[PDB]
Amino acid sequence: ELQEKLIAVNRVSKTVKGGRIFSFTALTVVGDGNGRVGFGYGKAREVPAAIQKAMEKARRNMINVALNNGTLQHPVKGVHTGSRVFMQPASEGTGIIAGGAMRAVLEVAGVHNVLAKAYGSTNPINVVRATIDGLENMNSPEMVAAKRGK
Template structure:
């Protein structure tokens, strides 16, 4: 399994005695054979939150249905204020996508897609939306 860290976010809680910092890590896990898992972990230390996110991603693995390493037709998904459009492309074109969409598609094993994002470009929402769009593929 291949692991990729999407984002680490520092959260601050203000209390009477000062500030308390905690960290949220978001990661994806895949094997380049159409399996992907998304996980989020929270902890007061960075390394613990990363480990938790990897463990949760391994538990939430989703099997996607498509035959080759290309998407067969146009896909669209929406999550919160994020809309992701995925268009099939030739092998010559390759991946034309944002940073987070590229990470998801690389970990699945898809290497020829043109994508567009409308609305919010929040990293976590874009990843969730891309996985939703890919899960809509029917055999």
């Protein structure tokens, strides 16, 4: 059963001949509690349809992230535009400690305990897609074993 939860929403403008006309945007991630976490982004005229459009778009862009027990295996870097992130396993307990606009995208991954921190400027739109490719670059011992002997 897939989960969902909203992150943020802000207004925009166009300022066309008649005057200022507005629109709304939303962003949301999804996760099944066993890795395999995606996200989406969409806009519409009003929030109740905007969030629905965002979620309906979010069903695409699925990925596959290997996980071990309940903690992430090895550290990983992350870079995109103007934001950088850092992570660390911290096996067992201590829950998850992380800043805002980072908690949700990691929670649905299923990991019940991990330690992480983000560096630099942290606009939420840019910060996402950093943990994504960070998990994409992740390797478990089976893959590296598949290219070197045992």
